[PDB]
């Protein structure tokens, strides 16, 4: 009928594929030469269950000077994709430490989907050898499942921008979660 | 540098922009980059260009658009929003519409500018929320609000990307809701708003035959008519209620039809959809007199189909069933009066007394000056516990409650037309003037009692106070005076104190008639209808759905064959009016 | 008032209460009362209510009538 | 030129306000001039507009409180003696200034001033009546009366309040003396205090009209009627 | 009261105004400076060049008539 506008924002450590994940979702064409630091001011049309939804995709980076302006993208946020890299274990442990409190502080009572990107690289020989150099291993799916339950994640999936694997379903669940209007209020004042 | 570009854009000189594209391509900079944008609000070059215009003409805009297309950031360039809370969400198209530049609006539309962009900054909220101007946060609604019909026509008829009229903002308001919001009671505003409303409704009808725009509701769950009734915008509500449209294709959208005429007498049907009691959806009449909080509420009842509906209701319940509700309280008063007083029958009636008080409390809790009635219900309770106990103080509680009941009889007088004004006047005096006067007088009396005690030179004060009340009556003798160290000063004071208490109370009567009753005298007739209306509504609310369905006013009429073919059957209430003028 | 005092017993009270409205009569009832403490406030309150409602009548008469 | 003052020390705007010439004062307050060279001479500027809503600045130079120079608003309602005073408050920037002030003090701080007199009334009421604490409060009673008188002398129907302050004084001398007539003085003053409560009612919006009406009746009609009635009663007593 | 009845609303504002003024008079210069109404605005560049900065009190008015 009449498309409903929902705001989606992606927050994660750098080089975990947030911009690429949105880009593959937008044009379904992997950019092999040029990747902007941020993908902004785009709205995508998606239908999940009899409803047509225009999803406005915001993107947050923190390489240089974007961290100062990051907070003002949080207001009026409908759904969040907290992203990290499967081929980089360092990303996982910082989510509970730093990413979560900022998200809760600026925009609480918002759905959150914890996702791990680039499932292909966990089996890659080069990445496996590099992690083994430090007696490390790629982020196991069990750890991601435990983390999702640990921090109240709405859902946990895995993406692969190079192979375009699971992107449609991931954002499909993202908007499905967004369409839920929370549950009233808790401990509301009189 | 950024200030130089801003100044160039401010002047409007296209020549000064020469060489900009080579600079940007050499530096690989974008017009949407942070450096070029103003840090305070994120403002870009194009908004600055739009805000400055020479006789409504700025030559930089096409060059800016051309270079933005050359660099390949046109989408980001035109969709870049402001991030300041004060001006959050504003885009170039909002400025273009606000500045009444048709050609620039068309250009921006042609260049892929977002047309459903929201502007939810604090400056765009209603007055209550601290904002200045509210229009619905959509370009289409913004054009509709500022009396720009050509822009609405273009936005809805453009080939590149049309703007759905059904679109809803964060609040859920549609264009019609915003139109109702910005309307006021001034004549010109109501006229322009009505014309815009009708044009919008007809356009939506043509574009969307199956749907009905007015049916759409906001997050709060208000239709445009209901919101117009609630907020007190009289003119648009009156126009929405008496909408008549000649066009055959859109005939079903209008409300007041005309069935037949026989000369100077005409009988026109009206539409009671969403305007009558015993309906699952909220009733416009009910919300108009329950949570209106509107200073023009009294004038909202003067509308043709509104006023008469109450008289038609009056026949069914008003004039025939007020007796029963009155009588119920009379019977309860008798049952209670039996308290002080066939031992078995008397005990049964005594149980009935507590049962009647409990029933009054049970219906009181369900209904929630009914706080006075609540006090009565509260007082009933303690008596049962103390009666089981055998304590001797339950009589005091019963005394308070009994007097409260006989006083409540006044509320029953208020309902009747004959006593409707007198009861309300007594209550108003008891609340506005009498209450404050008594409050002040009590403290004054206590202080003067202390003064009299000092002149006499707790129990010694209690005797004086009781005998002083007797002195006000005059039955009691002046026992205090005899036992006074300094009566000479007291004698003048005692008379003076009585004068002051009485004269201030005498002034209250003068104050009440003019200061308090001055506005009551003028609006008593309007208030009486409101009082009558509230009483009528409560009667219908009590009755269950079956009982309400028994007396749904009006007669079902098939107005005409609908698009589906099954005639539209609104529940219509005929109105008879004769007029010699015209034919 | 009869209940507070705790037909003829009501007749005496009524006649003497009319005298009380005049003020010539003494408060014979009060002496013979089980609970005068509650009655004392009420008796004054009752007189106020009777008079103030009648005082309002004069205000009502000039403008409403 | 408007800066220039006369011997009395009045600017044209201030004199216009004092003497009651409404039209020129309204025109001086809302002066707007298009000429660029003389732009600084006008008062009401227009900052921005967004369609049907406009927001225009105004100039409060020589028109606001807490200024060393005399305030036009203050002189308009202190020593105006103008029969058109009520219409002078209707001017746009004048009327609204009071509501903006009302938020800061009007609706939030009237309670405190009211309460101060309530507390003083209680302290005085303790007079008739932990011996050491009671004596300390008794000293506080005289101190409160003296404080009321001290603020009364600074402020100068405040002549009624002056009478209250006057009556407080005699009590100390007679209390040291041990004379028995100080009670009469205290009686007069105590009733005066509870009556002064009416002045506190006047400030509140709800009782603002009733208090003033009571005072006016007590002064215009009631005073003269009582004055005549006293003499008539004395003569009839002689008869 | 005939003249009082008509002008009571005007008198009440005068009564309210006098009471408001006394409150501000009592407070010392620092306390008064705390709540100087309006917002300082640089109206425009003056002849000297330093913008004229009157203490201005914004007034909001809407009007459909005209443009
Ligand atoms: N091989 C491979 N590389 C990827 C994939 N997704 C992302 N990358 C790499 O990740 C790098 C940075 O990712 P980016 O989009 O900038 O993530 P962001 O910094 O959080 O925005 C890119 O240069 C890509 O080469 C993938 O699916 N396969
Ligand atoms: Mg990036």
Numbering used by the authors:
A (entry chain H): 1 to 190
B (entry chain C): 150 to 490, 506 to 532, 549 to 637, 663 to 788
C (entry chain A): 632 to 637, 663 to 721
D (entry chain D): 362 to 490, 506 to 532, 549 to 631
E (entry chain D): 722 to 788
From the publication, what sentences describe this entry?
Surprisingly, although we overexpressed TRPV4 only, an additional protein density associated with each cytoplasmic domain of the tetrameric TRPV4 channel was resolved in the final three-dimensional (3D) reconstruction. The presence of RhoA in the final purified TRPV4 samples was confirmed by western blot using a RhoA-specific monoclonal antibody. The C1-symmetric 3D reconstruction showed RhoA occupancy at all four subunits of the TRPV4 homotetramer. We define this ligand-free state of the TRPV4-RhoA complex structure as the apo state. The apparent stoichiometry of RhoA and each TRPV4 subunit is 1:1 based on the C1 reconstruction. Although the EM density for the pore domain in the ligand-free state and the 4α-PDD-bound structures was resolved sub-optimally, the high-quality reconstructions for the GSK279-bound closed state and the GSK101-bound open state enabled us to unambiguously model the register and assign the gate residues.
TRPV4 is a polymodal, calcium-permeable cation channel that has emerged as a potential therapeutic target in multiple conditions. TRPV4, expressed in the plasma membrane of a wide range of cell types, is a polymodal ion channel whose gating is controlled by multiple endogenous lipids, and exogenous stimuli including synthetic ligands, cell swelling, shear stress, moderate heat, and ultraviolet light. Human TRPV4 adopts a two-layered homotetrameric architecture where RhoA attaches to the bottom layer. RhoA appears to act as an auxiliary subunit, interacting with the ARD through three loops connecting AR2-AR3, AR3-AR4, AR4-AR5, and with the membrane bilayer through the prenylated C-terminal tail.
